[PDB]
Amino acid sequence: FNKDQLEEFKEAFELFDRVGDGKILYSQCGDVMRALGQNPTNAEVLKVLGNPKSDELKSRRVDFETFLPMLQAVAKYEDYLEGFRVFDGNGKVMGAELRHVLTTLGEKMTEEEVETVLAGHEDSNGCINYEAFLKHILS
Amino acid sequence: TTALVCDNGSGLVKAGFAGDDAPRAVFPSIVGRPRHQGVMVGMGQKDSYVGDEAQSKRGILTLKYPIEHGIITNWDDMEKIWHHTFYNELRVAPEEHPTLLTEAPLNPKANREKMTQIMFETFNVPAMYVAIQAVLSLYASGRTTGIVLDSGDGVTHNVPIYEGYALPHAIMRLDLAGRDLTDYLMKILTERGYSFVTTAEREIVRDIKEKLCYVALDFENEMATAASSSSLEKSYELPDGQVITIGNERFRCPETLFQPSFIGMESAGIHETTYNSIMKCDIDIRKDLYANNVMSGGTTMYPGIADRMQKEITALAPSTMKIKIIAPPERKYSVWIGGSILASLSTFQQMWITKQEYDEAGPSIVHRKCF
Amino acid sequence: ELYTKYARVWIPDPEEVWKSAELLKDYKPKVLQLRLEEGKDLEYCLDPKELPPLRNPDILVGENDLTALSYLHEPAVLHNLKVRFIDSKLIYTYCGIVLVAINPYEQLPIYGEDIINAYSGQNMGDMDPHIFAVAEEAYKQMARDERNQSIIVSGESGAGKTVSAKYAMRYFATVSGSASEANVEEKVLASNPIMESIGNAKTTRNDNSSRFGKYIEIGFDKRYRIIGANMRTYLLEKSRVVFQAEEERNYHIFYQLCASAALPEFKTLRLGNANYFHYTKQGGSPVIDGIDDAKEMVNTRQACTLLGISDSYQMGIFRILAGILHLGNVEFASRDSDSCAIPPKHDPLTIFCDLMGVDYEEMAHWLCHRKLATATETYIKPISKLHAINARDALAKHIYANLFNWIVDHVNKALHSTVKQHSFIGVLDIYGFETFEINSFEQFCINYANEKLQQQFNMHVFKLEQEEYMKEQIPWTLIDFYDNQPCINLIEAKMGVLDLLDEECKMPKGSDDTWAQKLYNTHLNKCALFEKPRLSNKAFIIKHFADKVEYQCEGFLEKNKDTVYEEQIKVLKSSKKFKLLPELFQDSKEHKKTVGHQFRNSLHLLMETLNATTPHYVRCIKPNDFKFPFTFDEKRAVQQLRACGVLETIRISAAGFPSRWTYQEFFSRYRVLMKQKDVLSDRKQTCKNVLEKLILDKDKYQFGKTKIFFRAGQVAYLEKIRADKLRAACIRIQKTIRGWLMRKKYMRMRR
Ligand SMILES: C/C1=C\[C@H](C)C[C@H](C)OC(=O)C[C@H](c2ccc(O)cc2)NC(=O)[C@@H](Cc2c(Br)[nH]c3ccccc23)N(C)C(=O)[C@H](C)NC(=O)[C@@H](C)C1
Ligand SMILES: Nc1ncnc2c1ncn2[C@@H]1O[C@H](COP(=O)(O)OP(=O)(O)O)[C@@H](O)[C@H]1O
Numbered sequence A: 001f002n003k004d005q006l007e008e009f010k011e012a013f014e015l016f017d018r019v020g021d022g023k024i025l026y027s028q029c030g031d032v033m034r035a036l037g038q039n040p041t042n043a044e045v046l047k048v049l050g051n052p053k054s055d056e057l058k059s060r061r062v063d064f065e066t067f068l069p070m071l072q073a074v075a076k077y078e079d080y081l082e083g084f085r086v087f088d089g090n091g092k093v094m095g096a097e098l099r100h101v102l103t104t105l106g107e108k109m110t111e112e113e114v115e116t117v118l119a120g121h122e123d124s125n126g127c128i129n130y131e132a133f134l135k136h137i138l139s
Numbered sequence B: 001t002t003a004l005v006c007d008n009g010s011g012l013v014k015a016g017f018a019g020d021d022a023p024r025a026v027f028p029s030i031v032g033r034p035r036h037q038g039v040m041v042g043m044g045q046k047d048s049y050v051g052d053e054a055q056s057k058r059g060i061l062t063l064k065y066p067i068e069h070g071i072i073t074n075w076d077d078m079e080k081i082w083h084h085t086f087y088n089e090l091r092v093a094p095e096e097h098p099t100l101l102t103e104a105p106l107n108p109k110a111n112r113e114k115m116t117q118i119m120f121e122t123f124n125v126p127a128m129y130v131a132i133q134a135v136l137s138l139y140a141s142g143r144t145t146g147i148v149l150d151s152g153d154g155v156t157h158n159v160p161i162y163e164g165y166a167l168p169h170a171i172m173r174l175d176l177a178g179r180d181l182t183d184y185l186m187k188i189l190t191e192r193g194y195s196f197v198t199t200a201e202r203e204i205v206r207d208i209k210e211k212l213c214y215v216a217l218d219f220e221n222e223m224a225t226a227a228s229s230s231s232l233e234k235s236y237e238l239p240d241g242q243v244i245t246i247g248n249e250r251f252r253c254p255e256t257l258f259q260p261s262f263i264g265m266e267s268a269g270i271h272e273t274t275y276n277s278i279m280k281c282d283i284d285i286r287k288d289l290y291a292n293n294v295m296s297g298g299t300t301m302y303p304g305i306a307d308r309m310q311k312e313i314t315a316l317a318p319s320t321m322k323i324k325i326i327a328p329p330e331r332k333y334s335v336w337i338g339g340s341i342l343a344s345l346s347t348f349q350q351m352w353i354t355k356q357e358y359d360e361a362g363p364s365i366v367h368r369k370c371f
Numbered sequence C: 001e002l003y004t005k006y007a008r009v010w011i012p013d014p015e016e017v018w019k020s021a022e023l024l025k026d027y028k029p030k031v032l033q034l035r036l037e038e039g040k041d042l043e044y045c046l047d048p049k050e051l052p053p054l055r056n057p058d059i060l061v062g063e064n065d066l067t068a069l070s071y072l073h074e075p076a077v078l079h080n081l082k083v084r085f086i087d088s089k090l091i092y093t094y095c096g097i098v099l100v101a102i103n104p105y106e107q108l109p110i111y112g113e114d115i116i117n118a119y120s121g122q123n124m125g126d127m128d129p130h131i132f133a134v135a136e137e138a139y140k141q142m143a144r145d146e147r148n149q150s151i152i153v154s155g156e157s158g159a160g161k162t163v164s165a166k167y168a169m170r171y172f173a174t175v176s177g178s179a180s181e182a183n184v185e186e187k188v189l190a191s192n193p194i195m196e197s198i199g200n201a202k203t204t205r206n207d208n209s210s211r212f213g214k215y216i217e218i219g220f221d222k223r224y225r226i227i228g229a230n231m232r233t234y235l236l237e238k239s240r241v242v243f244q245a246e247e248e249r250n251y252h253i254f255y256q257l258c259a260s261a262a263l264p265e266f267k268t269l270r271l272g273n274a275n276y277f278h279y280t281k282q283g284g285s286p287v288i289d290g291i292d293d294a295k296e297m298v299n300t301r302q303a304c305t306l307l308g309i310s311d312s313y314q315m316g317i318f319r320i321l322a323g324i325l326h327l328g329n330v331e332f333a334s335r336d337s338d339s340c341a342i343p344p345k346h347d348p349l350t351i352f353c354d355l356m357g358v359d360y361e362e363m364a365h366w367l368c369h370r371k372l373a374t375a376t377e378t379y380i381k382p383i384s385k386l387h388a389i390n391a392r393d394a395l396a397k398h399i400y401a402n403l404f405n406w407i408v409d410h411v412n413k414a415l416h417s418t419v420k421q422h423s424f425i426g427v428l429d430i431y432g433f434e435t436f437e438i439n440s441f442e443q444f445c446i447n448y449a450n451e452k453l454q455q456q457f458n459m460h461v462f463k464l465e466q467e468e469y470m471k472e473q474i475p476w477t478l479i480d481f482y483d484n485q486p487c488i489n490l491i492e493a494k495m496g497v498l499d500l501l502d503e504e505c506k507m508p509k510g511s512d513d514t515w516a517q518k519l520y521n522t523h524l525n526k527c528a529l530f531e532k533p534r535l536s537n538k539a540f541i542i543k544h545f546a547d548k549v550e551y552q553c554e555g556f557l558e559k560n561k562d563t564v565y566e567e568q569i570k571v572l573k574s575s576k577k578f579k580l581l582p583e584l585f586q587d588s589k590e591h592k593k594t595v596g597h598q599f600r601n602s603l604h605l606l607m608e609t610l611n612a613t614t615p616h617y618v619r620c621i622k623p624n625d626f627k628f629p630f631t632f633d634e635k636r637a638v639q640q641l642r643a644c645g646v647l648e649t650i651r652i653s654a655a656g657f658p659s660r661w662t663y664q665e666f667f668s669r670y671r672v673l674m675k676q677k678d679v680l681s682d683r684k685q686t687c688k689n690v691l692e693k694l695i696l697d698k699d700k701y702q703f704g705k706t707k708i709f710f711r712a713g714q715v716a717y718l719e720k721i722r723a724d725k726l727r728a729a730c731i732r733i734q735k736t737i738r739g740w741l742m743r744k745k746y747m748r749m750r751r
């Protein structure tokens, strides 16, 4: 990362500092990584964090300088299409079924996250154009 | 398929099926050829008469016995007696059914070879075996341990057996018999003034012996008493209805078994062969032989013979030792009843001489399996 | 590898036979890292090399047919049954053609008439298993092809074989439309208290066991109306009449009689207290808990009346039974080893003779002597005391067995009906494998009868599958077959165990434990399945179909001897006092046959009857020892599933191609795993190419016309890879949407 990138990233990091000490929580590290354009899995986030325990994840605070090696480590379509073709054959997906699988399989998310991201993307049948939804969520 | 059990002795023949309780055919064993010139025309003259017919006809015929002692004296005659036994008296063809045949303890091997030869070769018997009579008497009488004493016409023999092992070196043979008892009974009847010369009349003598003889519990006391009175004396009716009356002689006929000097034979009486057979055996088993002593075959049917043997053995043997004698009423048949049991057993089924084993090795094979 | 973290395994637990576990980290070639439900902390060792049984995925679990599960092993079967029983309240279940049944002790509505109609047309595939589905298939088989059909039921009789048969008849009646014409079920169920009274006993493990096989032929007309029924019986366990081991009883009727003995109705019989008699005393257990025998006796009479056995004949029956009891108290003194005598004016023989009207002199004589007849001449011969005892016990067995055949003839007389029996369907009630810590000639007979039924079952199954493969145009030659003829030859062939017992009966001074030496000499290493227990020379072990069982020589000869002296029968047969006793014998070599030989002959009738006929099976299971309704115990059910051969049947099914799918049914589920280029216009060729790429070992699957088959476990392997690939795709998309939410929060701060 160059000086310009480090400055923009530090500014973003400070926006996530809710205490004023120039630090974020471990539990915010993932939030900062995703806010900076990374898409790490929960496993990758815990690995770069050093598999922290609950207590330090919720209350231990780290500044940008400690986050940075972790961001570096994290930094270092056809699969996405096949991944969507898993849930396909008219190019649509039920909203109920996508909601169920996203809230019940894998690294299960909340119903509110899915409702928020899905708002405005389903049609009258309750079908999502997934290539368009994917392009939208990848921008 | 169920297997025939058949005993040749001189005298009777018993034959029947294994698993029966008592023999299906019993008849004397005789061949008779007529000795008068047949005068009538269309009589139906017959080459020979076999078994019971000849005993009915006997006045006309001369009767020959094809078995003497144990030894088969001529073989055409038995070939007849077997032919008659299987075909008419059992009415079952000898190809269809295995067969078990019976012998004295010691006989010339030549006869057992000829017997197996006639069975396979002439009758086409599917399989057969030859078994020593005293063994069968043991099977017959519920024991694995005893000394057996058996006497028919022909042979008298002892075999000791202990938990199912024979002791070959102790086997005794002796030729006192129903037959030689009959011949002596005739020769003493001559002394009383009655005489029976011809072959058929010998069988009248034999019927006398069967009906009227008995053994003296003590010999000189009864001989004196019979000199002292006729209270002993009894009389009997010849086939024409003449009467004959017989004396102190009556007990003297079975007595010769107990004192063979009466017939001029050399061997001691059956006491001393029984005892010497026991003593020949190993000294522990003797306790068990004295307790179990078993009697077989028709010559031991004489009334009193059991109690006479208890008395004289108990004298002869060491005292203070239990001596018991076992004389079941069956005993005339027990060699057959034991053959029935032995032939029924499942284990035995291995032990037949099967026809192929003869075809390979000839008559020699019988010695290897049988005894 | 099949094992990975978040795989699941069964583990052995003594609390209950098998317990669920989940695997925490991937296994690589001696210790496994594991969670129980509780604790969720363990180590488990492969202990050379074992591997713990691997658990079917929940899609398979609960589905109707045990063969449909991809792994087939004792834990999975026991679990699937338990979940169907507890959660769905579904009692009936399938294993291939076999129908398994587990009885509740609650009563259920599912036999209700409507459901009969709902089954009445269907094939068994179209419906959940239920007893009517078998009754229906038998009915349709008898319609489609002219053959007769038989229905065969098994398992410890507490399991309700009676209720299963009763409903099988109710179905026959109601679909046949003969409810007006026929009283068949009404009479059949009226008959049951008689058979239960003269055929059942208390065995050391169970009360009201039934010791005989019972077969009931429902006759059909040419138009498949019910005509009526005919009853037969087989395999009656005569030895129990004389002898028992501790805590047994002999057949209930003797106790039902002794309980009633105080009534004026039986004052004639001079019955005593139930343990006064040497046949009822020996068990030490006069009373069954919670049965008032008098109250059962009343119901026994009322059933006899409802079957049209008169007040005249019933008092004959009880007169005979009292005769058997009094005969048991006869006792002998030995005067010498060769002979015995009855004490003067002996009281129980006096009473027995007056019960029979046969004079004290005559049978006092014949009890202690036996008669030879040679062709010329008879002989009359004393017998040892031991043989007198054997002969009396023989006679008591012969009388009982004939009285049983007689009562079954009259019950048939009531059931039987005139019209020509055009064809019939027959329903059979028989015990399964019986094993206790002590096993005896009765168990030996029961296990040999099972070995034969299990053979005929195995051949029937093999015939059906050798047919299905040729229907599917697959090679049948692949399918292997498993044959228990090497056991049956050990039991019943010449110089088997039976023939060396029947030999040892007649051999002189044959005795209980010198038989064993004939066994060891004949079999000990020459045979495969016969073993000697190391601790003892009085016992031997047979590798039966389901399990090893040891037996003990201690009872065998005295239980096995039967010989009846002709003239001891002649004395009774002559009697004038009352009608029935001459009626029993009214029908020469049989008197010599040992009990094991009469059993082998009775079993060949049964097999000759069933081999004429196309079976359909049932199995019954008793899910707790204590009658708690809808409660299931794994240590009992495992024992019964072993004892019913169900587990060993499933094990045979495991060998090859248990699992079947049709192309569209497979293709839909697995379409998730298919790349667009691999999808073809042709379903069969698509799935062929998919399977060949997904599974490299072509020996694991076979293609046929509509059904692919898989050797056990491949379907679970496919469900595993399906879950793995789908989960990976779901995690990718989930992480993406989690990043989108974050990106909006970041924009919110930036904005
Ligand atoms: C002159 C002698 C022998 C003979 C006359 C000489 C002839 C040459 O021997 C034979 O080959 C004939 C034959 C015989 C018969 C059938 C056979 O397949 C083979 C031979 N055997 C016999 O006659 C036997 C039968 C026998 C009596 Br009883 N118990 C016995 C116990 C065991 C064995 C056999 C027997 N027999 C009567 C004798 O030995 C007489 C007692 N022997 C003698 O007086 C001495 C002085 C020797
Ligand atoms: N009741 C009897 N009393 C005396 N002798 C008898 C009696 N019955 C048979 N015998 C004799 O026994 C002999 C037959 O004995 P047996 O054992 O039948 O011969 P085998 O053993 O060869 O058949 C003949 O001498 C016959 O007369």
Ligand SMILES: [Mg+2]
Binding pocket: B009, B133, B151, B152, B297, B335
């Ligand atoms: Mg003889």
